[PDB]
Amino acid sequence: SHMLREKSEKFAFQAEVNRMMKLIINSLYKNKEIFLRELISNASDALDKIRLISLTDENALAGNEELTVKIKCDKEKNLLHVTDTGVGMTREELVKNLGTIAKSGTSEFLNKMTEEDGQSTSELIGQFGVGFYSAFLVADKVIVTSKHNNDTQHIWESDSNEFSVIADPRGNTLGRGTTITLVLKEEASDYLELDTIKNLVKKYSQFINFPIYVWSSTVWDWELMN
């Protein structure tokens, strides 16, 4: 419209990355803690996907009949867990979709991600880029435990430079869905406190149609946060 070849995937990737780049900076200038918001939204979207799938595939929720989001803090082990029972991710998705983005130099493999899928690098960046990279505002590493209906449970790790994926030695523990694990920095220890997580979760979960729980306490159990 004002530049050459704006319809190109090269331009679409740059425009999407610029958009994400501006969303994270703007959040840092106003201090908005978008990552947990993005995690709850991204978990809700995965539940929407598997529920849309269940509308046509009768045996889609067989691995896990509940549609929840469960957030858990491990102040001892310094970990943040966001677990959804959504569509889940196959190993192919973790490697060729998320892995291609997480691995450095993603802009080299734009045409490799173009050869009809309906999921291009720029589209994946616009959909999941803000949530993925805002996690590195508070975390040093992102570990993804995911079990899709058409694959076995895998575990996937990245520091936004390299990535690695193995099969879960524990087997099929999720049934279906994804657990996002953030290895938070020491300067992000505030988000291991129950009160700040419960408050932030209830804020971002007020308008979510899916039940969202937080591991709360002399006995611990899942607490409804609406």
Ligand X SMILES: C#CCCCn1c(Sc2c(C)cc(C)cc2C)nc2c(N)ncnc21
| Strand pairing class (212-216; 69-74) | parallel
Return the SS3 of 17.
helix
With CB under 5 to 8 Å by kind, the binding choice for 189 among ligand X, Mg ion, none is none
Indicate which single residue of 161, 169, 187, 217 sits in contact with Mg ion (rule: CB under 5 A). Answer: 161
3-state secondary structure 50-71: HHHHHCCCCCCCCCCCCCCEEE
Q: Does 138 bind ligand X (CB under 6 A)?
A: no
Using CB under 5 A as the binding rule, whether residue 8 contacts Mg ion is answered as no
Upper half-sphere CA count for residue 212 (Cβ side, 13 Å): 28
Residue with Cβ nearer ligand X (135 or 214): 135
Alpha-helical (H) ranges within 149-207 are 194-205
Chain positions 152 to 181 lying near ligand X, rule: CB under 6 A, are 178, 180
Residue 11, annotated as binding a ligand: no
DSSP bridge partners of 141: 183
132 binding partner (options ligand X, Mg ion, none; Cβ < 5 to 8 Å by kind): ligand X
DSSP one-letter code for 18: H
30 binds, among Mg ion, ligand X, none (CB under 5 to 8 A by kind): none
Number of chain positions touching Mg ion (CB under 5 A): 7
The bridge status of strand 177-184 relative to strand 212-216 is unpaired
Residue carrying the six token digits 């993603």:
106
Note whether 20 binds ligand X by CB under 6 A: no
Q: Which is nearer to Mg ion, 33 or 123 (CB)?
A: 123
H or E segment at 147?
strand 139-147
- Subset of residues 59 to 98 that bind ligand X, contact rule: CB under 6 A: 84, 86-87, 89, 93, 97-98
Q: Is 18 annotated as a binding residue?
A: no
Residues binding ligand X (CB under 6 A)? 42-43, 46, 84, 86-87, 89, 93, 97-98, 101, 124, 128, 131-132, 135, 142, 144, 178, 180
